[PDB]
Amino acid sequence: SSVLASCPKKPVSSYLRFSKEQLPIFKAQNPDAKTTELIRRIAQRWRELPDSKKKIYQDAYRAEWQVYKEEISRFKEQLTPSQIMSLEKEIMDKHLKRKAMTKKKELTLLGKPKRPRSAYNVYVAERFQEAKGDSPQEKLKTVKENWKNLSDSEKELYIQHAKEDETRYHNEMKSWEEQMIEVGRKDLLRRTIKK
């Protein structure tokens, strides 16, 4: 039920067409080399390739562009309003998710401290494994139920471990945010802390 998946995609431009055909060859002749390295060498092949040769690829791309113009129009015109709407949402959702992940992958490279664990988090970590259930979803529900029934005294270790992680997070954030200052990124810093 995804309009987007059935949507005609843009033809590949010249270099990539080349790359798409070259890679399996380089891989055959260099079976153990990392793809990373093969691509670099392939781009070098492309750079050295005489303009008259690239033109061949470009000509193909330009022709492919013409069939794409025709395909995309016919497709769009064939779409009902509700389908147009879901296609737009799908594109929208796809974009935001891509931007989110990109930001997440960054912070992770930058070594941003995980946020604090709650007493509940700590509880799940201690009790998940022995919890009955056919699936993680069911085994989490099991834990959730037993948690709601925990007394305040039964909760003491979980809360204590949570408190301990609060201290952990505080410290780690301190150090990180300072390191981010050195790299001149006070924009990654929190606008508001508490205690």
Among 120, 161, 168, 172, interactor with DNA by CB under 7 A: 120
In 22-169, which ranges are E strands? none
Least Cβ distance, residue 80 to DNA (angstroms):
22
* Distance set, CA 93 to CA 9, 81, 83, 89 (Å): 18, 18, 15, 6
Please say which residue, 32 or 81, places its beta carbon nearer to DNA.
32
> Is residue 132 at the binding interface for DNA, with CB under 7 A as the rule?
no
Q: Is 163 in the site for DNA (CB under 7 A)?
A: no
Per rule CB under 7 A, is residue 75 in the interface with DNA? Answer: no
Please, what sign has the CA dihedral across residues 133, 135, 138, 142?
positive
**HSE-up (13 A, CA, CB side) for residue 193:** 11
- Out of 77, 114, 130, 151, name the contact with DNA by CB under 7 A: 114
Nearer to DNA, 132 or 191 (CB): 191
- What string marks each residue from 15 to 44 as x (binds DNA by CB under 7 A) or -? xx--xx--xx--x------xxx--xx--x-
Q: Judged by CB under 7 A, which of 1, 78, 82, 129 binds DNA?
A: 129
Integer distance in angstroms from the first to the last C-alpha of the chain?
Answer: 49
Asked if 39 contacts 23 with a C-beta cutoff of 8 angstroms, the reply is yes
